[PDB]
């Protein structure tokens, strides 16, 4: 922009992956699983003779499993260590993930709503004991979706493995005393799902194995759409079941759980820990939403991330949300169910917008110390780092 394409960076601090690069890179120009680990024990046998490395981060940690003590010191995809993060940061600065230095430079990142920020502040003070940028930017995680297109209304919605979010929005204001999120995604769903598999005799040790569901969950998994007709079909036909080679070799045999594990989203009482699930929460959300907003929201609500590049569930949701409406609220009027125009709201760009959602601000903001928060405003003991 007003200076080089280097020396400013954008990064998704995501829970499945970190996705990162110089600000306005084509993609998040490096992507890696959010993984770390440093050596322990796996083999029980005389093999390997490796020499080459000890500790690992992310894309180089992948092969190793228990050859590393792997960790994610976490609750809600929000960390509870300071230091392995550092060794990751220290790694990332190489062509490793970035090829950068930081004092000379500036960066764009994100913050949880109700981040207990005293810990961000301590980290930031360490960043400004270390990486020490000439300027910085941070904003509430969901807000950065509305940026490639300059958007203002709806609910702002996210998921993946670690967490889910549900931000009610109008004229760009999220409605804060009114706001929602859900504190999980595919992680503990994989705990529940793998509990099903023990019962099949797939009693396999999790410690080496849980993240196998991840392979297929990432490479291969889906949702249907017909889904109540699909329940009817599934036991009556039986032959609609599936299987796959665990790539050590083993074909293991797998029913609807492939995308019936999603039913715990809409009926958390699946896991006996009760729930009407997110689709009832959504009804409640739009019951709280006012006349105009709820009516606009028939085609005016917003979605994010690779976790939204998802077949059939959108179709099943509107199939579903014609209902509770008609049922509870129209209480039997019907004549407008399509006349409530309905057009879909999750496009191919939801792939790259994990970082490209952020990047379209830097495209108008790198020259703006109107925007840049600073190392100076930390050094001040200033009440926050920001203009």
């Amino acid at each position: 922009m007003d200076s080089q394409g280097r020396k400013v960076v954008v990064c998704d601090n995501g829970t499945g992956f970190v996705k990162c690069g110089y600000a306005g890179s084509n993609f998040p120009e490096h992507i890696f699983p959010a993984l770390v680990g440093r050596p322990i024990i796996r083999s029980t046998t005389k093999v390997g003779n490796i020499e080459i490395k000890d500790l690992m981060v992310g894309d180089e940690a992948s092969e190793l499993r228990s050859m590393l003590e792997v960790n994610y010191p976490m609750e809600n995809g929000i960390v509870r260590n300071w230091d392995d993060m550092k060794h990751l940061w220290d790694y990332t600065f190489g062509p490793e993930k970035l090829n950068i230095d930081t004092r000379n430079c500036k960066i764009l990142l994100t913050e949880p709503p109700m981040n207990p920020t005293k810990n961000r502040e301590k980290i930031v003070e360490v960043m400004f004991e270390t990486y020490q940028f000439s300027g910085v930017y941070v904003a509430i995680q969901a807000v950065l979706t509305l940026y490639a297109q300059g958007l203002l209304t709806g609910v702002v919605v996210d998921s993946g493995d670690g967490v889910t979010h549900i931000c009610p929005v109008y004229e760009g204001f999220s409605l804060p005393h009114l706001t929602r999120r859900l504190d999980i995604a595919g992680r503990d769903i994989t705990r529940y799902l793998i509990k099903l598999l023990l019962l099949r005799g797939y009693a396999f040790n999790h410690s080496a194995d849980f993240e196998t569901v991840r392979m297929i969950k990432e490479k291969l998994c889906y949702v249907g759409y017909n889904i109540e007709q699909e329940q009817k079909l599934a036991l009556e036909t039986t032959v609609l079941v599936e299987s796959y080679t665990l790539p050590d070799g083993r074909i293991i045999k797998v029913g609807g759980e492939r995308f019936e594990a999603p039913e715990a989203l809409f009926q958390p009482h699946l896991i006996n820990v009760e729930g009407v699930g997110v689709a009832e929460l959504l009804f409640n959300t739009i019951q709280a939403a006012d006349i105009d907003t709820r009516s606009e929201f028939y085609k005016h609500i917003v979605l994010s991330g690779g976790s939204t590049m998802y077949p059939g569930l959108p179709s099943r949701l509107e199939r579903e949300l014609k209902q509770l409406y008609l049922e509870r609220v129209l209480k039997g009027d019907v004549e407008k169910l399509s006349k409530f125009k309905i057009r879909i709201e999750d496009p191919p760009r939801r792939k790259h917008m994990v970082f490209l959602g952020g990047a379209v601000l830097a495209d108008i903001m790198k020259d703006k110390d109107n925007f840049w928060m600073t190392r100076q405003e930390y050094q001040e003991k200033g009440v926050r780092v920001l203009e």
Binding site: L146, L152, F173, D333
Partner: protein, 371 residues
């Protein structure tokens, strides 16, 4: 040449050029404001929003008519409307050529200082005046004598008339307007059963109140019929979804002006009060009113209004009183039409106080005309 001409009143601001028959420009006399957050500021937008700006941007805004008892409160904001009226509306300047001006009688009078000061010190028509609207409505009617009702959005006046002289102590300038019904009509919703109140729901309480409401015709029996036979209630789509069929309400609220006192309310009937203008007249002058029952202002386009009123006016009236009804097309705008009819008589050239006369005599030049 032109004196610009207007219904500058409550509800909508409605303005044009003298030589129009109707306003060239019309927009709500509303102000919207961002009372609560729309956080993406730097998107290039106001803290305060004129009329149709408010009707547009009530996608975020919350709003008022800053008008206590039908009296302007906030010149400070109100001028950005008048600003808007050539930023956006008539555009040809105040300082270009004349413009007609009106209000209504007996006031917190020193109001007029801010007013007259403003009129020259911001907008500065080179010359201007301060008058009262009923002339225009008679001038659209084709009269210099008779009677006039302003049944407007934000005030009323009933006005008996004598060839450019007054029948003064019988002019029922009245607190009531089409606005006040909405208060009761906002309350009906609660025992009808529902979740409703806001500044926006109070505007929503306007639509049947223009459309499917009408003045009740024999309310005791009308309600006895709607209670025994709520086929007297008419469907209406509510985009909220607590959707209705409404009727007993739909003429309850129009009647309650005639029938108010149960809730502690020290209010007469509207009809009796209008008749009290006639009571303040004389058998010397009363038929002069009944020969000339001219309608004007916001509400007068209603169903039931002239019908029940001619019923109740007839029921209050003596012998000799032909209750001659004059309810013209655009009676509601006989102010504007009449404004062009007054402004097209050139004598108002002589009426205008120049900026020079308001500087010279002081702004006080135009109060003291009390007869």
């Amino acid at each position: 040449t032109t004196a610009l001409v207007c219904d500058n009143g409550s509800g909508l601001v409605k303005a044009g050029f003298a030589g129009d028959d109707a306003p060239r420009a019309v927009f709500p006399s509303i102000v919207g404001r961002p009372r609560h957050q729309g956080v993406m500021v730097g998107m290039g937008q106001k803290d305060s929003y004129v009329g149709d700006e408010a009707q547009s941007k009530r996608g975020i805004l919350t709003l008022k008519y800053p008008i206590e008892h039908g009296i302007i409160t906030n010149w400070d904001d109100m001028e950005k409307i008048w600003h808007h009226t050539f930023y956006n509306e008539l555009r040809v300047a105040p300082e270009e050529h004349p413009t007609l001006l009106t209000e209504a009688p007996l006031n917190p009078k020193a109001n007029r200082e801010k007013m007259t000061q403003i009129m020259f010190e911001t907008f500065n028509v080179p010359a201007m005046y301060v008058a009262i609207q009923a002339v225009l409505s008679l001038y659209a009617s084709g009269r210099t004598t008779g009677i006039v009702l302003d049944s407007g959005d934000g005030v009323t006046h009933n006005v008996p008339i004598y060839e450019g002289y007054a029948l003064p102590h019988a002019i029922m300038r009245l607190d009531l307007a089409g606005r006040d019904l909405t208060d009761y009509l906002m309350k009906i919703l609660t025992e009808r059963g529902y979740s409703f109140v806001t500044t926006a729901e109070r505007e929503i309480v306007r639509d049947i109140k223009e459309k499917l409401c009408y003045v009740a015709l024999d309310f005791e029996n009308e309600m006895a019929t709607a209670a025994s036979s709520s086929s007297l209630e008419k469907s209406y789509e509510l985009p909220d979804g607590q959707v209705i069929t409404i009727g007993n309400e739909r003429f309850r609220c129009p009647e309650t002006l005639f029938q108010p006192s149960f809730i502690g309310m020290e209010s007469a009937g509207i009809h009796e009060t209008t008749y009290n203008s006639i009571m303040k007249c004389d058998i010397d002058i009363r038929k002069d009113l009944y020969a000339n029952n001219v309608m004007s202002g916001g509400t007068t386009m209603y169903p039931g209004i002239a019908d029940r009123m001619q019923k109740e006016i007839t029921a209050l009236a003596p012998s000799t009183m032909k209750i001659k009804i004059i309810a013209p097309p655009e009676r509601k705008y006989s102010v504007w039409i009449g404004g062009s009819i007054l402004a097209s008589l050139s004598t108002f050239q002589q009426m205008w106080i120049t900026k020079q006369e308001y500087d010279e005599a002081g702004p006080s030049i135009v109060h003291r005309k009390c007869f």
